[PDB]
Amino acid sequence: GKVYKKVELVGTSEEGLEAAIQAALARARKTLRHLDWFEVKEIRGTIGEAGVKEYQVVLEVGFRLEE
Amino acid sequence: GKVYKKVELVGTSEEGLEAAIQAALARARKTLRHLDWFEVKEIRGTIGEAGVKEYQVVLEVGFRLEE
Amino acid sequence: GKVYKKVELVGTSEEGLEAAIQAALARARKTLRHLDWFEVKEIRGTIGEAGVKEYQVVLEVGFRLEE
Amino acid sequence: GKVYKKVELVGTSEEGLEAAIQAALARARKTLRHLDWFEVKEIRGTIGEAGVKEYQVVLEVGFRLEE
Amino acid sequence: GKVYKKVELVGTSEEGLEAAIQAALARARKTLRHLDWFEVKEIRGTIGEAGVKEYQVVLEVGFRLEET
Amino acid sequence: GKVYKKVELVGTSEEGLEAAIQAALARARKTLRHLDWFEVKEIRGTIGEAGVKEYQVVLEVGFRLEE
Amino acid sequence: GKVYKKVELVGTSEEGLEAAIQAALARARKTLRHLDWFEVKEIRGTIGEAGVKEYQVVLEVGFRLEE
Amino acid sequence: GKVYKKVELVGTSEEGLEAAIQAALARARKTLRHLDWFEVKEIRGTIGEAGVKEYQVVLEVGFRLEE
Amino acid sequence: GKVYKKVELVGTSEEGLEAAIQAALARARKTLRHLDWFEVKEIRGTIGEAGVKEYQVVLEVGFRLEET
Amino acid sequence: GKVYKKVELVGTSEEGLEAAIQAALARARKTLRHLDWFEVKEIRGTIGEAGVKEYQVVLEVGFRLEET
Amino acid sequence: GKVYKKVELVGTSEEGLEAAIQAALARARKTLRHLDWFEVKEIRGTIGEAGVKEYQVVLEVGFRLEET
Amino acid sequence: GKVYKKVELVGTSEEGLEAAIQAALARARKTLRHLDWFEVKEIRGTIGEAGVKEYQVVLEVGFRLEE
Ligand SMILES: [Cl-]
Ligand SMILES: [Cl-]
Ligand SMILES: [Cl-]
Ligand SMILES: [Cl-]
Ligand SMILES: [Cs+]
Ligand SMILES: [Cs+]
Ligand code: NA
Ligand code: NA
Numbered sequence: 083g084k085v086y087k088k089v090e091l092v093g094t095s096e097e098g099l100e101a102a103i104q105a106a107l108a109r110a111r112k113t114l115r116h117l118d119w120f121e122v123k124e125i126r127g128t129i130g131e132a133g134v135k136e137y138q139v140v141l142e143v144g145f146r147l148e149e
Numbered sequence: 150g151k152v153y154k155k156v157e158l159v160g161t162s163e164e165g166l167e168a169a170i171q172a173a174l175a176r177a178r179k180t181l182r183h184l185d186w187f188e189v190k191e192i193r194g195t196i197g198e199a200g201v202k203e204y205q206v207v208l209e210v211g212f213r214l215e216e
Numbered sequence: 217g218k219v220y221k222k223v224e225l226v227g228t229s230e231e232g233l234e235a236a237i238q239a240a241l242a243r244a245r246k247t248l249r250h251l252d253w254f255e256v257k258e259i260r261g262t263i264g265e266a267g268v269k270e271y272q273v274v275l276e277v278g279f280r281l282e283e
Numbered sequence: 284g285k286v287y288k289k290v291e292l293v294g295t296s297e298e299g300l301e302a303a304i305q306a307a308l309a310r311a312r313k314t315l316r317h318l319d320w321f322e323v324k325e326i327r328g329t330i331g332e333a334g335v336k337e338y339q340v341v342l343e344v345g346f347r348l349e350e
Numbered sequence: 351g352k353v354y355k356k357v358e359l360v361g362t363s364e365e366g367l368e369a370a371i372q373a374a375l376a377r378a379r380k381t382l383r384h385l386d387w388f389e390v391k392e393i394r395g396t397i398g399e400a401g402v403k404e405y406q407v408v409l410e411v412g413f414r415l416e417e418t
Numbered sequence: 419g420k421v422y423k424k425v426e427l428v429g430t431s432e433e434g435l436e437a438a439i440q441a442a443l444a445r446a447r448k449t450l451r452h453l454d455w456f457e458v459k460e461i462r463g464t465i466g467e468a469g470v471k472e473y474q475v476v477l478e479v480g481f482r483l484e485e
Numbered sequence: 486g487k488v489y490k491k492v493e494l495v496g497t498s499e500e501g502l503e504a505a506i507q508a509a510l511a512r513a514r515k516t517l518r519h520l521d522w523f524e525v526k527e528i529r530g531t532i533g534e535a536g537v538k539e540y541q542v543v544l545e546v547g548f549r550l551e552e
Numbered sequence: 553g554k555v556y557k558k559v560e561l562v563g564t565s566e567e568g569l570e571a572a573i574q575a576a577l578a579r580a581r582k583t584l585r586h587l588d589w590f591e592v593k594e595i596r597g598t599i600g601e602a603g604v605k606e607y608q609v610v611l612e613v614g615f616r617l618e619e
Numbered sequence: 620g621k622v623y624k625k626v627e628l629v630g631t632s633e634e635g636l637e638a639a640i641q642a643a644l645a646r647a648r649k650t651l652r653h654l655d656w657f658e659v660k661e662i663r664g665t666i667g668e669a670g671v672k673e674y675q676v677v678l679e680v681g682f683r684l685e686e687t
Numbered sequence: 688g689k690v691y692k693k694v695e696l697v698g699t700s701e702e703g704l705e706a707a708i709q710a711a712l713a714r715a716r717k718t719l720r721h722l723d724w725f726e727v728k729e730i731r732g733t734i735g736e737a738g739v740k741e742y743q744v745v746l747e748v749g750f751r752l753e754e755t
Numbered sequence: 756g757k758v759y760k761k762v763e764l765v766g767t768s769e770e771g772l773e774a775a776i777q778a779a780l781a782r783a784r785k786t787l788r789h790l791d792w793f794e795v796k797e798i799r800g801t802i803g804e805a806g807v808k809e810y811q812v813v814l815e816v817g818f819r820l821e822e823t
Numbered sequence: 824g825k826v827y828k829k830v831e832l833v834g835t836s837e838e839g840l841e842a843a844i845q846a847a848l849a850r851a852r853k854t855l856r857h858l859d860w861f862e863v864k865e866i867r868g869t870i871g872e873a874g875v876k877e878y879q880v881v882l883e884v885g886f887r888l889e890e
Pocket of ligand 1: 089694
């Protein structure tokens with residue numbers, strides 16, 4: 083029947099976790115069609131003087147393949 | 150001595166991670182007694198036109214069993 | 217060449233996930249030099265009357281070592 | 284929002300994998316309401332003189348919690 | 351054919367691992383029928399002045415589900 | 419020497435496991451060249467009134483890249 | 486008391502998953518005594534013109550040892 | 553230089569964990585030479601009327617190979 | 620709020636698992652303050668003529684850190 | 688902010704691990720822009736009469752995605 | 756159809772990873788027929804005054820079984 | 824009896840895998856006594872114009888503690 087594909091992206095953001103997820107999804111929407119779900123694989127980040135510099139959320143994004 | 154039980158729930162929310170966790174704890178409180186701790190096992194979600202539609206946090210809820 | 221070391225900490229907070237992470241980092245800054253990055257290993261917490269009492273994020277902090 | 288629960292079952296069958304999955308789902312339908320999805324965790328079995336005696340499929344079954 | 355169910359329990363004991371395990375099974379027997387096997391998932395515990403205060407063994411208990 | 423690439427697909431089918439795998443390979447053949455092997459990563463599915471509604475097999479498909 | 490041993494085999498077949506498993510078991514019966522149970526570790530395969538050429542199921546076979 | 557080999561065994565015993573391990577080692581000593589180390593992979597068991605019927609410890613035994 | 624640190628130790632013992640664990644905790648209380656819990660990560664060991672020579676239990680010890 | 692992408696490649700080489708890795712990156716450079724890091728997932732290979740025929744290193748290559 | 760068996764070996768070497776691997780395969784071809792592939796499971800080693808004393812690579816060797 | 828401790832380090836090097844490991848050991852020898860064994864946990868690295876910029880090997884170093 084239907085077939086899906088999953089790509090692995092790493093969304094980053096200095097705001098927070100949800101923000102990094104959205105950044106990844108925002109860029110994904112630009113070149114992928116029929117985005118359906120995502121799965122967080124990892125949550126890491128860089129440290130700066132104020133603490134968390136950038137939050138990086140590794141995630142898989144699943145989308146339906148046309149035909 | 151004491152014995153605990155763990156149930157796996159999946160809390161969802163359109164607002165965020167914490168929210169989805171709280172939603173699962175909220176509903177757990179209604180039928181489970183002596184809730185002690187939780188563990189997040191997965192963080193996934195659905196995608197909509199605006200990006201994240203629903204955040205789904207799969208977690209285990211540990212509670213003490215009565216004798 | 218360079219060499220890094222990783223330490224495992226557990227930041228806690230009643231505010232949220234990001235907060236618990238910053239708390240760990242904050243305290244790490246006090247005794248460790250050259251903090252570079254962090255990795256989230258686990259996300260767990262305690263349950264109170266109002267739901268989540270305290271969020272506990274187990275994370276590894278990596279930092280550069282002096283030759 | 285909505286909250287789901289997952290229970291772990293082990294469906295068995297001498298016919299095959301799909302059969303063992305269905306056996307588990309058949310019994311689940313008897314006492315659980317709003318079954319939505321399943322996830323295969325393990326696939327094992329017992330050996331007899333003709334080879335596979337019983338196929339055992341360990342799976343999690345997710346269902347929506349009412350209210 | 352047959353269909354089993356697995357619940358996750360955490361047995362505790364100040365004595366030792368084997369005790370923690372039995373503690374969890376003892377309580378399991380009280381409300382579950384047809385217990386068949388168990389699998390240890392984690393072994394952890396609390397620390398006191400004398401060392402290990404309590405041993406906590408997280409395990410899964412498998413049991414046979416009946417007809418209806 | 420030679421280099422291969424792996425894509426993650428999710429083949430679905432209402433008939434069975436093999437079927438869902440074939441569905442993913444079928445669609446992969448249409449846009450990928452030199453398909454060599456596959457690996458099943460997860461087996462999950464939806465539930466309907468009759469039990470299993472759709473079998474979903476997540477798998478990785480390996481293929482040789484051209485120079 | 487009793488003691489078991491586990492060996493890792495890889496059954497193959499062009500028919501299907503169950504077939505590949507029986508093939509491994511069949512051949513195990515020829516040199517091993519007291520086969521008790523098996524565990525599926527991986528499911529993979531090769532790709533041909535018609536889709537799946539050969540299904541390969543990596544499994545562990547456990548059997549009782551003679552004192 | 554030296555080359556070792558590892559075999560996976562499952563020691564059983566109604567006494568306890570240490571017992572089950574010893575049982576496996578005892579039987580291993582009978583057909584394997586130069587036993588050096590072991591690694592516990594799993595700990596499970598059966599359940600009887602008095603609780604633990606038998607303790608089963610899955611472990612790998614490593615020994616040096618001759619040449 | 621509070622912050623904890625975890626260190627990985629390997630307690631050995633010729634007696635048994637619980638012993639190996641206690642060994643590690645004993646040594647741990649000598650240089651670490653506020654020990655709270657432990658998590659067993661691996662269980663391995665050396666083989667001797669009598670079977671198990673020494674039981675080695677890899678565990679993580681978690682303790683609270685002082686702001687100072 | 689920035690968003691990266693990861694593709695999984697399998698570099699092969701009769702020379703050694705390091706070579707297999709470079710082989711995969713070399714080919715990666717041909718069609719991917721802004722390569723930043725790689726992570727080794729598996730190390731396997733084929734066996735010949737002389738021993739290792741080919742080393743195969745499965746790895747993930749991370750790269751920065753552009754604006755549009 | 757065909758059936759393969761996998762054995763776990765640990766190849767050691769003071770030279771390097773690839774060497775350790777070759778060591779294991781060399782010994783393997785002495786008592787096993789039809790070796791086809793290997794999979795590295797772990798990489799560990801012993802420490803000496805000069806750093807790495809011996810590299811130990813745990814790997815699984817897969818070979819085809821003969822019906823007979 | 825004896826008690827060991829393990830620290831996680833990340834050796835780096837532009838030369839190779841063995842180099843990166845040695846680097847970490849070298850630096851470990853400077854502040855840790857009785858180094859016995861190491862375990863490789865991860866192998867990653869950065870990418871430059873010539874391919875591998877630097878090899879990074881995450882490993883745990885175990886040493887005996889005194890008393
Ligand atoms: Cl792609
Ligand atoms: Cl339940
Ligand atoms: Cl430390
Ligand atoms: Cl063997
Ligand atoms: Cs004991
Ligand atoms: Cs090398
Ligand atoms: Na958050
Ligand atoms: Na099937």
